């Protein structure tokens, strides 16, 4: 539920598994930058979805943009704010079994996580 990469920490990643009809999902998490230099989340790789698109700018969630990670701050990806859209689900997801995902940061590199799939 916590992942350290460089001076970053990915904390409690999760997503609401799609409803029986939907094909897309939304990925959420806390990302800490505990270092003195900025970073950004630039891409996400997920085998069980067709693609992942980062909407990192909370002022304009339509824009495809990386999540900026200012030094010594926690950034929140959450419903109604910055998030990652997971597009075109290949397989069906089930509550309890996490979703394996690779987060790519501009400077800290790649990290493999298991996102919690939550019942609601």
């Amino acid at each position: 539920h916590e992942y350290d990469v460089g001076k970053l920490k990915v904390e409690h990643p999760w997503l609401r598994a799609p409803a029986d009809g939907e094909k897309n999902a939304s990925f959420y998490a806390f990302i800490h930058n505990n270092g003195d230099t900025p970073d950004k989340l630039v891409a996400v790789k997920v085998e069980k979805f067709g693609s992942a698109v980062i909407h990192g700018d909370a002022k304009n969630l339509a824009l495809e943009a990386p999540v900026l990670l200012p030094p010594k701050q926690k950034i929140t990806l959450a419903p109604g704010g910055a998030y990652v859209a997971l597009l075109d689900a290949k397989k069906h997801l089930e509550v309890g079994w996490g979703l394996e995902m690779t987060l790519v940061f501009e400077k800290a590199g790649e990290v493999v996580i298991d996102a919690a799939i939550d019942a609601p």
Side-chain angles (χ1 to χ4, degrees):
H1 292 70
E2 320 187 82
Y3 301 87
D4 299 287
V5 54
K7 288 305 209 278
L8 312 178
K9 174 184 293 189
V10 181
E11 191 170 51
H12 302 333
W14 64 283
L15 70 79
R16 241 162 230 147
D20 304 298
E22 270 290 348
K23 312 158 48 210
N24 306 320
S26 297
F27 168 83
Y28 305 120
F30 295 152
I31 304 163
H32 302 254
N33 184 350
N34 304 311
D36 60 2
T37 56
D39 211 331
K40 46 177 67 97
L41 173 75
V42 296
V44 175
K45 306 177 198 177
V46 54
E47 270 283 318
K48 288 195 184 170
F49 284 84
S51 69
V53 171
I54 310 187
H55 296 285
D57 185 355
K59 293 161 97 67
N60 190 348
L61 284 172
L63 170 68
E64 301 186 7
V67 181
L68 307 188
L69 304 170
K72 297 301 189 181
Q73 298 192 27
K74 176 182 98 170
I75 300 297
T76 292
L77 281 53
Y83 75 108
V84 180
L86 308 186
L87 306 176
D88 295 307
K90 304 189 178 305
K91 294 180 182 291
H92 173 66
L93 306 175
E94 182 73 5
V95 187
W97 277 272
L99 178 79
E100 174 165 281
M101 296 168 76
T102 296
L103 270 48
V104 188
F105 299 95
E106 182 184 36
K107 293 177 187 306
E110 302 197 353
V111 60
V112 174
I113 67 182
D114 287 352
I117 299 173
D118 292 333

